[PDB]
Design an enzyme around this catalytic site. Sequence first.
Site, PDB file in Angstrom:
ATOM      1  CG  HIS A  82       7.127  -3.291  15.449  1.00  0.00           C
ATOM      2  ND1 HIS A  82       6.676  -3.125  14.154  1.00  0.00           N
ATOM      3  CD2 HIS A  82       8.423  -2.896  15.449  1.00  0.00           C
ATOM      4  CE1 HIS A  82       7.657  -2.647  13.406  1.00  0.00           C
ATOM      5  NE2 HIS A  82       8.726  -2.497  14.168  1.00  0.00           N
ATOM      6  CG  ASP A 161       6.805   6.081   9.639  1.00  0.00           C
ATOM      7  OD1 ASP A 161       7.984   6.414   9.872  1.00  0.00           O
ATOM      8  OD2 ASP A 161       6.435   4.890   9.543  1.00  0.00           O
ATOM      9  NE  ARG A 168      13.410   8.117   9.331  1.00  0.00           N
ATOM     10  CZ  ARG A 168      13.675   6.990  10.004  1.00  0.00           C
ATOM     11  NH1 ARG A 168      14.824   6.806  10.660  1.00  0.00           N
ATOM     12  NH2 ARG A 168      12.760   6.019  10.032  1.00  0.00           N
ATOM     13  CB  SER A 183       9.632   5.635  12.307  1.00  0.00           C
ATOM     14  OG  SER A 183       9.243   4.778  11.250  1.00  0.00           O
TER      15      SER A 183
END
Lengths: 433, 433
Positions: A82, A161, A168, A183
């Site tokens: 990632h 999420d 958020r 997340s």
Amino acid sequence: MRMVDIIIKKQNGKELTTEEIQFFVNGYTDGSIPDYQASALAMAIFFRDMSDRERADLTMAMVNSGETIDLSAIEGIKVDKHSTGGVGDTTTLVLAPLVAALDVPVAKMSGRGLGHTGGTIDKLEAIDGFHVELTKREFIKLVNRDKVAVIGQSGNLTPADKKLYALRDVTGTVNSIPLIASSIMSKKIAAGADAIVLDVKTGAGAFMKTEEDAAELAKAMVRIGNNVGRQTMAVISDMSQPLGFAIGNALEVKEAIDTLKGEGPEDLHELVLTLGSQMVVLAKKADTLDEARAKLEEVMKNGKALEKFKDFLKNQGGDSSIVDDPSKLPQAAYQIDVPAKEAGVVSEIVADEIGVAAMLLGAGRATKEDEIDLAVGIMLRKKVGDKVEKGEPLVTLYANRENVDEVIAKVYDNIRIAAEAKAPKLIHTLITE
Amino acid sequence: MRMVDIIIKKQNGKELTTEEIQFFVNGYTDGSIPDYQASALAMAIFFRDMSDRERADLTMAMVNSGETIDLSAIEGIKVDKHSTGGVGDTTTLVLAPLVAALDVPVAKMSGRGLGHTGGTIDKLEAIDGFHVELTKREFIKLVNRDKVAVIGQSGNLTPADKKLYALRDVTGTVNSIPLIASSIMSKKIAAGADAIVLDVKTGAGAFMKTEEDAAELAKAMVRIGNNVGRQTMAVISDMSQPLGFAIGNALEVKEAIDTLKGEGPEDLHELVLTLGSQMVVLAKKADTLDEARAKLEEVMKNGKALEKFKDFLKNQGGDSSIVDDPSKLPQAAYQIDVPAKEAGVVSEIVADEIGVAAMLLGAGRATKEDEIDLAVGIMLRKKVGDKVEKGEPLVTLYANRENVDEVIAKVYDNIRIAAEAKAPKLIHTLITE
Ligand code: NA
């Protein structure tokens, strides 16, 4: 009713229980709990933080908010990379073939999405005939046999999420170590990975603007991964400037092919190896990073990494002769240079804005149903640190369009030249344990 | 976005400007700003706090958010009192005539509301024929003539505060010095008061439950008042136990009658004078609190306090013979003594729970749909720091019902007895300047 108590617990810095956290996540997911409580709670977390243990339980609660991908049928330790965004980042293209050449299973799930350039499917489908027209059982068989494949992402992975991040963003609770770290790991664990490598980006053009924060967020994610049996490691790489020279789709595939032959840019090469080493280690195929690096550098030279790309392509319908002859990739009609208005050393290349400029060529999707032009993009002719004489090209724009005035303009506003300039450290910090 | 930037400014401890604050209040009032942004903002306030300048701007933003009453037609400085909720508190019933008898214009705006006993208006129902609603002219006439009148709070004074309270309550951002200091002062400044006296409670009952926090909240509210030129003073009174003996409506009127003759309970009498003194000084009818006190004590012994009560009752339709003949007040059917199970000194009378016990007899409203029985209540026979023999009545329950076993049980479970005990100091401190 019970939410308000959990919020007040959090205000005082009380470490929430597993069941308390799971009540919020599932209650917020199914529409029981309203968003003004979620946002209130998000801010409470922002100030008084969470423990390593609350993180691990929040992370896991979000996983279980939707579908869970089971890759038990795929054999070995499947490591999943990632990255936290990065303009011109070609690592994913290089890494999947490179790492599979050392018998490490790569079960990629990727998409198209919105951005400066296309997704890994977009970029790959520049290889004439390539597709992800295949089932899960086809997917499993190919990874077990050839150690690499890619399918489309599933619909319903961690919808908690999705809704939390969206809240958020619009309540300014994005910048929170527990919320970001959870997340991210949630999406990668739900995706079915055994181990995880993280490319947490830092520098002037990065999400975590400071190395102080980069190393902390990364460290938080390692400890989460370790606390739920997903051996995790992390690179802190620089993104003040774009990675490599290619910013595009067909352009980046060409650049991936180079790096697969050991002929890549200095920076892309190094990052590919560092990230690759961490993966190769995570799947028990080397003891230490240097041995993995050596093995990876060998398969670059062997052409085995390169052949594993061709195998991977022909397995999913792509004309593998395009790897051998890159000029078969979709070509841009016009090829326009952006000459320096000034002499010196290139001091600054505002990564994101160069990314935007390439997007403006057609190279990425500003909106949901925009169409990418795989041919178009930007090839950097200079990097931060190189000398340049007035009139020498900084950049070459690749377009299917004569008029690129807005694009040339955005390039000049975001490339500074000075008397002296020192390129930042690419690889800052590795986190193992 | 705007609001997001406002939230983030506050996250970092930056002072909000005046325009930002109005935008929020006007925005959240009209519906532009959604609930989750409002809740995230209040949570940011809660943690990073505000300054006197911001509190003043927030206060006035909330004032202007709805309509404003303009009492300029009433001559003299119209001082108003606000109490932060207290069980058995009858000071408003006493003060309004007591200070008006010294030619201080009491232009009182009150409400019924929920709680342990009814509001000031609920209490004043007990004198049959008394009513609350007459015209703004009839209000202004009566105050210029007799210096005393009570009408209902009506329409939207501080609609921002109406909505934002509910939000704070249901998002756990009720306990913030900036938020309540504004909430109180806004509603009061909005009601047309020139000067303000604050009765900030402390102890087991009341929202603030410590002398440090109580003073902190008061000193904040005084400062806001002086900042906006609405000269303000405060009393920090104890409320660990109920005030006086009488807890109810008809009962508290009777107790207020006694106090108006200088024949009240010591605590109620002391709180009245202290509160009264402040009001008289803010109304420029004395240079000195000492002087002010003396005038109030003279008017009690004179009858002038009590005559002004009668005048006030006659002015608003109330049968003023009930003052001279208390037994005319709606009587209760049953009159049950609750005998002490233990000899000793009474150490603890948990004020709020006694208020609840009284509520369970019919003296208050748990929900908006309840109706108060004005006859019922509780007469305390002992206060904290009184000797009590085993079998002596601690309390008398005035009821219109035969079975009151839960009410009895609650009294037992919230009155402790010990070998020694001293009640707190009633008047902890005063904020004069
Ligand atoms: Na690149």
